[PDB]
Write a protein that binds this DNA or RNA. Structure first.
Lengths: 555, 411
DNA sequence: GGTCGGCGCCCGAACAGGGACTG
DNA sequence: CAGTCCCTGTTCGGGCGCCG
């Protein structure tokens, strides 16, 4: 076996185990022909070698058809070898995005044919890559090979090829500094601001520099004219767009069909603005079977028809210009849904997106807006390495009131107010001092762990009083119920005294939406008020009416 | 031609495996130049995916510093080598450093690049440099010398450091020198003028051995924030309710606090804004509770085996309070920071500044870094904190959500 | 019957840590 | 007193999308 020009990567096994010893699967006669045809071909080129009985290792193997070709792909079921192979650190930290590319004069894309099979495997590790090829007869002992290159299905194959590829490209990228080479597996986006004459020369230099190591760049996958097909997009000299997305049009929807629908909708939302998958994701909750048929709700059918109409019109994105600023503008879509657009020139979107995660049981629009700003910031630094300027649908004074009074540290980068309804605001403000001339409600509530029964009420300074028996409740729900009572039976200005830290911790966060219906009713009553002053006092200390109302709601 | 000190992990623990977080363009550019230069000097060397370990890396600029500085988040690697920089070759902490009039910090991390690292341990110092928009895969390196920010670096270099400081400690036996991580703390009672002069003598004394800034401190002027009760002449029902709640919370620290006579003033179901005269028995309970807050807590002392913990409270208007403790309600030190950088505009910058000031005090007083309880959402902190970090060490932290109780630490 | 790695989203189950009440 | 439970938050397993 000749020596490969590429340096090999030393690979070990986990300390305390040995190679795989698994029996071969019964393969169809149509896949047996596809394997023996390739095994005898790779053996001629020095990619696999025969092994005798001295190799006590064996692993399954099968084949999968290639997309839009009559060629077959050889895959190995290394699930037993991967569970024993050493752990690797993947060098692929993310996926490039077309919005991060810069306008270049000349652009060239090319793909390396059979990349794994052109990169050598470690010499001391080839013994563990032993498999068997079943013949057309079940009585034939079959041929046993071992891999001399990177297999397909081994957990170390992708990381090794990516690191080996970068080492070969370093001497070329060191001699040609102004050449942008996006490297993702076997796809090589090559661009330059050099003239179109010297560009093809550098491309052929790279095709010969790669050829010196066993990497072939066939002219079949070579691309010289726009539009370029790269990473699932269509690169035009001035714009880009995703490859055509096909949504299923099933008359009867299953759970797995929704996942394929939601998956493509998220993929479309990177450039198609306004995609909403709120009501469609409400179909996946509480379900157990992937093949279970589920009918579409009225809110889900309306959300699907809107997304289809957006996909009808053609949309496109522009490229990144480092000379001009980066702008990001967010809109409040649905209840819990946000969409944003990142651009440098008005209506020339680099990319779009959506944020709709529900963090916690109680929240408001200011919290969700801050979460969205953070998601956009991290995403922006990945693609462009900088934080965009933000145009936010929230008043400057609104945000100043929130972050200065909040107890948690919070902050938004350099932003400006854009007047695009609906605006984000605070629906109610708790006073900082007790209200003069407002009735003072001392509320309390208790329950029993066993009977699940409780009381909730209040006592005021004007003699007013109420107690309500409650069934199937807890200590926490009663203390919220006692505050909900005080809000209902009070005027526009009301001071409320409680000993519940749990209830006070919820209301001070100024929520406008909650998962609890009782909280939403407390919110709706707080919005109706003009001045509300809450206050906390320790319980069981004989404080004001808080001891009198504690004794009434005792049972 | 130097012999390497053998280093091992703690038994039963693998190496660190932490992913590299996104970096800005100005940071990535600053790291490629430094790593290429350090690779040309043999300090680091490129590696491959067969190394399963990785530690995050980013860059900083110290206070009033133009030059970028490489920084590795070795917090996970330091946790997995804790038995080395303590049992084997620890550093004694001088109890007189916190008493000096002026203490200066010197970044001596460049000296660790002179000592080679044990060959078997280099596998754990691996780190990855990311690219913008994932243009290229990860450019991984590993350390061939003593890495900056590793707690094992000052331990191995300690013997070499003592022999360099011996001519200087002899001529100046009254000057205290403490080494923590990449920093050298030099404290003296000298006047501010001749103090900086002695610093320059030590700078040139370190340049002749192969080693430039300076951060001045004044531990004798460090103040604490005690718990104080309001000095009101006319008390309302709401004030007395706030006072009782605060005295009830404070009673967990000073067990001698009583609220019996004050709670008796809150018997009727009165209006919060109604004025209440303080009885004779209540006025004495308030004056006596003010004196117990002047006394020190009983049975509080530093335990060197226990970890330090720091809590920070956002008091608004650019005010931040903190408490350092090992056992709950046994606070070793309290304090309050005000008018820091970013006040009245950026909370994350102020919180970052506070953590650095607190950690600095924890190094001067006890020689340890605390574990912080940060009053911030995790995703908010993990997005912005690197934009304001100006220190060569990184403390450990967790995130808390404690709504304000009864404003115990600030009036 | 169905291979690996990377990133993204959505969900529920399992984990976990704090506060008020009870033997 | 240590034992629960009511509550909330985080972490992770697993499905899809997309790329090679």
């Amino acid at each position: 076996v000749p020596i490969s020009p590429i340096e090999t990567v030393p690979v070990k096994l986990k300390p305390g185990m040995d190679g795989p010893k698994v029996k071969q699967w019964p393969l169809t006669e149509e896949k047996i022909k596809a394997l023996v045809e390739i095994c005898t071909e790779m053996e001629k080129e020095g990619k696999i070698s025969k092994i005798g009985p001295e190799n006590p290792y064996n692993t399954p193997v099968f084949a999968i058809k290639k997309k839009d070709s009559t060629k077959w792909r050889k895959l190995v079921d290394f699930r037993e070898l991967n569970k024993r192979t050493q752990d690797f650190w993947e060098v692929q930290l993310g996926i490039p995005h077309p919005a991060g590319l810069k306008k270049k004069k000349s652009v060239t894309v090319l793909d390396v044919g059979d990349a794994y099979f052109s990169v050598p495997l470690d010499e001391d590790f080839r013994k563990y890559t032993a498999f068997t090829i079943p013949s057309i007869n079940n009585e034939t002992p079959g041929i046993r090979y071992q891999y001399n290159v990177l297999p397909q299905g081994w957990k170390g194959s992708p990381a090794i090829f990516q690191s080996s590829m970068t080492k070969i490209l370093e001497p070329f990228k060191k001699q040609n500094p102004d050449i942008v080479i996006y490297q993702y597996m076997d796809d090589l986006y090559v661009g330059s601001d050099l003239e179109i004459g010297q560009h093809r020369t550098k491309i052929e230099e790279l095709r010969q520099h790669l050829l010196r190591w066993g990497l072939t760049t066939p002219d079949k996958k070579h691309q010289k004219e726009p539009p370029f097909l790269w990473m699932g997009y269509e690169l035009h000299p001035d714009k880009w767009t995703v490859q055509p997305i096909v949504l299923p049009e099933k008359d009867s929807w299953t759970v797995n069909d929704i996942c394929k629908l939601v998956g493509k909708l998220n993929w479309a939302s990177q450039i198609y603005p306004g995609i909403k998958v709120r009501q469609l994701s409400k179909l996946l909750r509480g379900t157990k079977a992937l093949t279970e048929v589920i009918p579409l709700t009225e809110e889900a059918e309306l959300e699907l028809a809107e997304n289809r109409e957006i996909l009808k019109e053609p949309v496109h994105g522009v490229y990144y210009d480092p000379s001009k600023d980066l702008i990001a503008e967010i809109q409040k879509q649905g209840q819990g849904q946000w969409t944003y657009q990142i651009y440098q020139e008005p209506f020339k979107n680099l990319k779009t997106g959506k944020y709709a995660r529900m963090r916690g049981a109680h929240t408001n629009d200011v919290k969700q807006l801050t979460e969205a700003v953070q998601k956009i910031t991290t995403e922006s630094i990945v693609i462009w390495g900088k934080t965009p300027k933000f145009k936010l649908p929230i008043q400057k004074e609104t945000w100043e009131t929130w972050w200065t009074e909040y107890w948690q540290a919070t902050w938004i980068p350099e932003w400006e107010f854009v007047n695009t309804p609906p605006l984000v605001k605070l629906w109610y403000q708790l006073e900082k001092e007790p209200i003069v001339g407002a009735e003072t409600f001392y509320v309390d509530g208790a329950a029993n762990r066993e009977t699940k029964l409780g009381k909730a009420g209040y006592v005021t300074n004007k003699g007013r009083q109420k107690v309500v028996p409650l069934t199937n409740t807890t200590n926490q729900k009663t203390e919220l119920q006692a505050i909900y009572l005080a809000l209902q039976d009070s005027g526009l200005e009301v001071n409320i005294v409680t000993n519940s830290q749990y209830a006070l911790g919820i209301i001070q966060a100024q929520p406008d939406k909650s998962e609890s219906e009782l909280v939403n009713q407390i919110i709706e009553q707080l919005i109706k008020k003009e001045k509300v002053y809450l206050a906390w006092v320790p319980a069981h200390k004989g404080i004001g009416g808080n001891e009198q109302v504690d004794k009434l709601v005792s049972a | 031609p130097i012999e390497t000190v053998p280093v091992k992990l703690k038994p039963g623990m693998d190496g660190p495996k932490v992913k590299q977080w996104p970096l800005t363009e100005e940071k990535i550019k600053a790291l490629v130049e430094i790593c290429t230069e350090m690779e040309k000097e043999g300090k680091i060397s490129k590696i491959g995916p067969e190394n399963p370990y990785n530690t995050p890396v980013f860059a900083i600029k110290k206070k009033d510093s133009t030059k970028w500085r490489k920084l590795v988040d070795f917090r996970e690697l330091n946790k997995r080598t804790q038995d080395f920089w303590e049992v084997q070759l620890g550093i004694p902490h001088p109890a007189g450093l916190k008493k000096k009039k002026s203490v200066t910090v010197l970044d001596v991390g460049d000296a660790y690049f002179s000592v080679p690292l044990d060959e078997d341990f280099r596998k754990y110092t691996a780190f990855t440099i990311p690219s913008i928009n994932n243009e290229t895969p990860g450019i991984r390196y590993q350390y061939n010398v003593l890495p900056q920010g590793w707690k094992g670096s000052p331990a191995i270099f300690q013997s070499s450091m003592t022999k360099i400081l011996e001519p200087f400690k002899k001529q100046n036996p009254d000057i205290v020198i403490y080494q923590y991580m990449d920093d050298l703390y030099v404290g003296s009672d000298l006047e501010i003028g001749q103090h900086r002069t002695k610093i320059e003598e030590l700078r040139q004394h370190l340049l002749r051995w192969g080693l430039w800034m300076g951060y001045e401190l004044h531990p004798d002027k460090w103040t604490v924030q005690p718990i104080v009760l309001p000095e009101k002449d006319s008390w309302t029902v709401n004030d007395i309710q706030k006072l009782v709640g605060k005295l009830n919370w404070a009673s967990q620290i000073y067990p001698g606090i009583k609220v019996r006579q004050l709670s008796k003033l809150l018997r009727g179901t009165k209006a919060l804004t109604e004025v209440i005269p303080l009885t004779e028995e209540a006025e004495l309970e308030l004056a006596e509770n003010r004196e117990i807050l002047k006394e020190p807590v009983h049975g509080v002392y530093y335990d060197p085996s226990k970890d330090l913990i720091a809590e920070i409270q956002k008091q608004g208007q650019g005010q931040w309070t903190y408490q350092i403790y090992q056992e709950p309600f046994k606070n070793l030190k309290t304090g309050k920071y005000a008018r820091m950088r970013g006040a009245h505009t950026n909370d994350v910058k102020q919180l970052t500044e506070a953590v650095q000031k607190i950690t600095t005090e924890s190094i001067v007083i006890w020689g340890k870094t605390p574990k912080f309880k940060l009053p911030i959402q995790k995703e908010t902190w993990e997005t912005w904190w690197t934009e304001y970090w100006q220190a060569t060490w990184i403390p450990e932290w967790e995130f808390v959500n404690t709504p304000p109780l009864v404003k115990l630490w600030y009036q």
